RNA sequence: AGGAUAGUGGCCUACCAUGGUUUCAACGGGUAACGGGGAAUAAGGGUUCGAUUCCGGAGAGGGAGCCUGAGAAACGGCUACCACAUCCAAGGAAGGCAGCAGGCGCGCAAAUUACCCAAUCCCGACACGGGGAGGUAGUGACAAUAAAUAACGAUACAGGUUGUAAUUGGAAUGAGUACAAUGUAAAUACCUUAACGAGGAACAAUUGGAGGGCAAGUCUGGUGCCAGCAGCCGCGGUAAUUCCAGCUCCAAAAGCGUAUAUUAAAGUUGUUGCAGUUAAAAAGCUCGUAGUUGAACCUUGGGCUUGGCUGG
């Protein structure tokens, strides 16, 4: 019949179940960031496992080697183009050098907290899930939304919601027409 | 051996009807709860940390 | 409400003398602009009939206030309802809905008639005599 | 299997049609034409895919039996005929006129040339033998038989059809310094010179060609058409490329430079 | 060197030698031969019905003292008879004889677990209802 | 040498030789064996799986034989037997779901007797018919993606400029519910969307545990070697950190245990990479064949000219 449509996980679970020294960590990167649980950690660190181990096997090349060229710049503009990597950091090598702190350091909930729109950073997902803030044009209530650096600076509210010059929402037009 | 004793323990258990409890936050909100009570407002007995230390 | 619409990836189809396009809908504050008020609105635009001109495949943007579709318009309407297929005539009012049974209705007769040999009129007319 | 297939799963489908997964079970299987079916392309596949005047399967079919499509100079009926190399197809209500050549990328770039250039075809003489009452013919590589060639002409050589009386018109010799338009393997697309032919009795024989950017590649003589006698003279208008090769870095830059 | 050969063309004595020596494993032999196919009640299946035919109490083994409460059932399947344990306090109430009772294993793979002795299996279901819904008493047996 | 074949060929026949395969594993047996592209797991080397979205093959209850036809030893073609099996007026007649849906049995184990040719393509005398091919919907916690059950203040005690713990609010919003439009062959759904839709915001999150491994109690009550738990070590014989209850807490979360098989763990199958004095394991000892492995040695050095890319 049809040919099948790809499916591929995003996350993957630790060996070792119950390590306090882990369970700790994940719990202080998340809960300083509002992550929802531990597959949004689970998959930010298998998400940077593969980054890595791209950057792992062009290391054993020898170096001027076009895949190790190609490939490796290739990877290294995507990164810098969402800010984990730093400009002055395109060396391949420190690509290896990221810690889940910097990508989730990129994320839509993380910035919308900096940027000063909520009060705290679980009020920074409470924006984005109640469809508040626009990206560009572009509505995005995606927590995890990676911001790229061109869309860094194009994070606001919403023109139709209701803290943005939009009308007013279910509750307040209940009360306020009451 | 005979069958007879078979649930004799939870038979004559008595009774007990469970306290009604305001119910816990969900979600990213039990993952908030959590977070203060271990990292930011510590009961620790001066470097001696007992997560469910029984009453004495 | 300041229903803007905008074409683009525009490709000349003599072949089948139409003309066709990307139909970009600007519709903020509404829920989506509907296929007979587009029509209505692209014929004054470029100046043809609102018979002849196609529209389809309409799906909003996230977020609302913006649509996207596809269109046709044809130089003619007899030219539209020669290349255009019996659904879309009949979504636009240009030819009416076919009349038959359903599919499960169509087949129980034709494996009824593999069962006649001749003419139908032979077959009950010989059933007749027999059963006389 | 008691007997031919005539059907095509999509993922079955030659690989250069970029036929998309998620359309549908089938492909359009060619039926049998002056090409073979691997290496060729159903004229449904051209009129919707390339061309996109066909939303559907079903509008290119309307097309056809209004008798605008042309190939090589004559009326197709079939909505899956084998169009292929050199094929020129015109659609004079467009007054567009095409000949199907390979792009340096290996697939069926869409290639307008002029009216009077879709008069002409060139064709790869397969064989030269004698057939009935002694008269000696000529296959090419779409399969057209021409009576009373030139005695001159013989295997792996490029004639000129004319298109239009089934003719010869001029016929290109193959030799050394030959240009060469290659179509199979991994080098298909690739357009240059022959440096030097090495015989394998017995076997495939190689044709070693040097590229517009002194790449030497070696392709089998199975895959080798002469396109012009001389560097830099096709006889047809070559597409986009010219035949040349890149390296996947360049490409990239020059990406990188045209949109930015 | 090693006692094993290395010479470049020796690679077929390396294919026999290993594939001898993988029988002298257990978890390869088990396999291979088939014996669960064969000699084991669930004739290498998962879970099984049955029907029960005696409830027996097992004296413990040592130092244990108590008594494990089984029953005798009978396989649909092929018609063995085996006997499974009933784990829960009071789920001996729960099952009849005669009763169709689903069964699984005691996750030890065929092995005696613990104290008690000869038995491997469990009830999971009777009635098709779970013995766990039934000792939480979140439904009811069907009668 | 002939016959037969579309054709080669012991494919078959007549005559004549005695050949062919095999420890480099022939032949026989088992297969819970259709093969492959692939899947699972994996630092690497590997191990297990592959009925199954593609390709090749075989089969239509088990055999056998043929008609038509370019193409069939065809089964939604026939004939005959075997085994089942439907009607019968008892003379006869008709069967083949390993197609679609659906019914019985078997099991640990698996969906609606829905709609339609609109999309893909096929077949036909063919721009027009047909298509359970194909597509759409119904059931579906097979798997996978994204992702709700709240948020921020004011009091208030504690507290070190603020993290809260209780009783006090005004907002936001989708879960759902619906105009309508879109969506479609026609619908459902998604998205957009008027109006409705949250204070216990009952619009209530669960699955397992809390001796160790292994995260989370030596808290209270019940039982008293009994009930039972416990993958293993053990816990229970009247203060049980382990059963039976409550409270508290932990791990994961729309997901969490059980069983089985298998992979890693396993350097416990070891080519990489095990061990063999004593823990299992050097043949009693020599000869010896296949196999595996086998001393060194044959134009080096010098001299000149020149092309190319690295550092400056």
Redesign the pocket.
């Known amino acids: 019949?049809?040919?099948?449509?790809t499916?591929?996980?995003?996350?993957?679970?630790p060996?070792?179940?119950?390590?306090?020294a882990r369970?700790?960590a994940?719990?202080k990167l998340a809960g300083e960031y509002?992550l929802?649980?531990?597959?949004?950690?689970?998959?930010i660190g298998f998400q940077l496992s593969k980054i890595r181990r791209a950057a792992r096997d062009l290391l054993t090349r020898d170096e001027?080697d076009p895949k190790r060229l190609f490939e490796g710049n290739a990877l290294i503009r995507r990164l810098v183009r969402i800010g984990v990597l730093s400009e002055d950091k395109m060396k391949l090598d420190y690509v290896l050098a990221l810690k889940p702190e910097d990508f989730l350091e990129r994320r839509?909930?993380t910035q919308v907290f900096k940027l000063g729109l909520?009060?705290?950073?679980?009020?920074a997902?409470?924006?984005?899930?109640?469809?508040?803030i626009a990206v560009g044009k572009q509505?995005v209530?995606?927590?995890?939304?990676t911001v790229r650096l061109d869309s860094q600076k194009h994070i606001d509210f919403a023109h139709?919601?209701?803290?943005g010059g939009?009308?007013?929402?279910?509750?307040?037009?209940?009360?306020?027409?009451? | 051996?005979?069958?007879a004793?078979?649930?004799?323990?939870?038979?004559?258990?008595?009774?007990?009807?469970?306290?009604?409890?305001?119910?816990?936050?969900?979600?990213?909100?039990?993952?908030?709860?959590?977070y203060?009570?271990?990292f930011?407002?510590?009961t620790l007995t001066n470097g001696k940390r007992?997560?469910?230390?029984?009453?004495? | 409400d300041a229903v803007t619409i905008r074409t683009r990836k525009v490709i000349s189809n003599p072949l089948l003398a139409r003309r066709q396009f990307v139909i970009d809908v600007l519709?903020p504050?509404?829920?989506?602009?509907?296929?007979?008020?587009?029509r209505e609105k692209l014929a004054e635009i470029y100046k043809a009939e609102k018979d002849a001109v196609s529209?389809?495949?309409?799906?909003?943007?996230?977020?609302?206030?913006k649509?996207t579709?596809?269109g046709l318009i044809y130089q003619s309407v007899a030219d539209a309802k020669?290349?255009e297929?019996?659904?879309?005539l009949?979504?636009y009012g240009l030819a009416e809905?076919?009349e038959?049974?359903?599919?499960?209705?169509?087949?129980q007769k034709?494996n009824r008639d593999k069962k006649i040999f001749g003419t139908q009129r032979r077959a009950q007319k010989r059933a007749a005599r027999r059963n006389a | 299997?008691?007997?031919?297939?005539?059907?095509?799963?999509?993922?079955?489908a030659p690989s250069h049609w970029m036929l998309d997964k998620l359309?549908?079970?089938?492909?359009?299987?060619?039926?049998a034409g002056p090409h073979k079916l691997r290496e060729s392309l159903?004229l449904?596949?051209f009129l919707?895919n390339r061309l996109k005047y066909?939303?559907?399967?079903?509008?290119?079919?309307?097309?056809?039996?209004?008798?605008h499509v042309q190939v090589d100079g004559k009326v197709r009926?079939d909505?899956?005929y084998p169009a292929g190399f050199m094929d020129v197809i015109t659609l004079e209500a467009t007054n567009e006129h095409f000949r199907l050549v390979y792009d340096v990328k290996g697939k069926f770039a869409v290639h307008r040339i002029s009216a009077e250039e879709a008069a002409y075809k060139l064709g790869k003489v397969k064989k030269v033998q004698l057939g009935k009452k002694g008269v000696p013919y000529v296959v090419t590589h779409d399969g057209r038989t021409i009576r009373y060639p030139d005695p001159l002409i013989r295997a792996n050589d490029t004639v000129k059809i004319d298109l239009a009386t089934g003719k010869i018109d001029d016929f290109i010799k193959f030799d050394t310094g030959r240009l060469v338009m290659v179509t199979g393997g991994r080098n298909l697309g690739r357009v240059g010179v022959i440096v030097h032919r090495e015989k394998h009795e017995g076997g495939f024989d190689l044709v070693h060609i040097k590229d517009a950017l002194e790449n030497t590649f070696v392709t089998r003589l199975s895959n080798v058409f002469v396109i012009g006698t001389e560097a830099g003279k096709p006889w047809v208008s070559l597409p986009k490329g010219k035949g040349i090769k890149l390296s996947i870095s360049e490409e990239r830059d020059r990406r990188r430079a045209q949109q930015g | 060197g090693?006692?094993?050969?290395?010479?470049?063309?020796?690679a077929?004595?390396?294919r026999?030698?290993?594939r001898?020596?993988?029988?002298?494993?257990?978890?390869?032999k088990?396999?291979?031969?088939?014996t669960?196919?064969?000699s084991?009640p669930?004739?290498?299946?998962?879970?099984?019905?049955?029907i029960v035919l005696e409830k027996i109490?097992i004296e413990?083994k040592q130092?244990?003292?108590?008594?494990?409460?089984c029953v005798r059932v009978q396989?649909?399947?092929?018609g063995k008879k085996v006997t499974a344990?009933?784990?829960?306090?009071?789920?001996?109430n729960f099952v009849d004889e005669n009763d169709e009772v689903?069964?699984?294993?005691?996750?030890?793979?065929?092995?005696?677990?613990?104290?008690?002795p000869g038995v491997?299996?469990?009830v999971?279901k009777v009635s098709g209802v779970?013995l766990?819904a039934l000792?939480?008493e979140?439904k009811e047996k069907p009668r």
């Open positions: 019949p049809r040919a099948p449509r499916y591929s996980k995003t996350y993957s679970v060996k070792r179940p119950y390590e306090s369970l700790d994940e719990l509002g929802k649980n531990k597959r949004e950690i689970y998959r001027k839509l909930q909520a009060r705290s950073i679980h009020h997902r409470v924006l984005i899930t109640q469809r508040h509505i209530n995606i927590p995890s939304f139709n919601s209701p803290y939009g009308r007013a929402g279910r509750v307040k037009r209940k009360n306020q027409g009451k | 051996g005979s069958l004793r078979a649930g004799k323990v939870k038979s004559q258990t008595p009774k007990v009807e469970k306290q009604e409890k305001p119910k816990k936050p969900q979600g990213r909100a039990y993952m908030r709860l959590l203060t009570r271990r930011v407002n510590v007992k997560m469910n230390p029984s009453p004495a | 519709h504050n509404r829920a989506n602009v509907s296929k007979d008020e587009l529209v389809f495949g309409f799906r909003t943007q996230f977020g609302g206030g649509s579709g596809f020669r290349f297929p019996a659904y879309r009949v979504r809905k076919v038959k049974a359903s599919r499960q209705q169509r087949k034709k | 299997a008691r007997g031919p297939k005539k059907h095509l799963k999509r993922l079955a359309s549908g079970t089938y492909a359009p299987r060619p039926s159903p449904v596949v919707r066909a939303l559907n399967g079903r509008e290119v079919k309307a097309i056809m039996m209004q008798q009926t909505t899956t | 090693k006692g094993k050969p290395r010479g470049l063309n020796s077929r004595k390396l026999v030698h290993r001898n020596n993988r029988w002298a494993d257990q978890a390869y088990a396999r291979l031969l088939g669960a196919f064969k084991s669930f004739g290498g299946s998962s879970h099984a019905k049955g109490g413990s130092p244990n003292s108590a008594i494990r409460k396989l649909i399947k092929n344990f009933v784990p829960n306090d009071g789920c001996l689903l069964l699984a294993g005691f996750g030890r793979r065929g092995k005696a677990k613990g104290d008690i491997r299996f469990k999971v779970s766990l000792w939480k979140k």
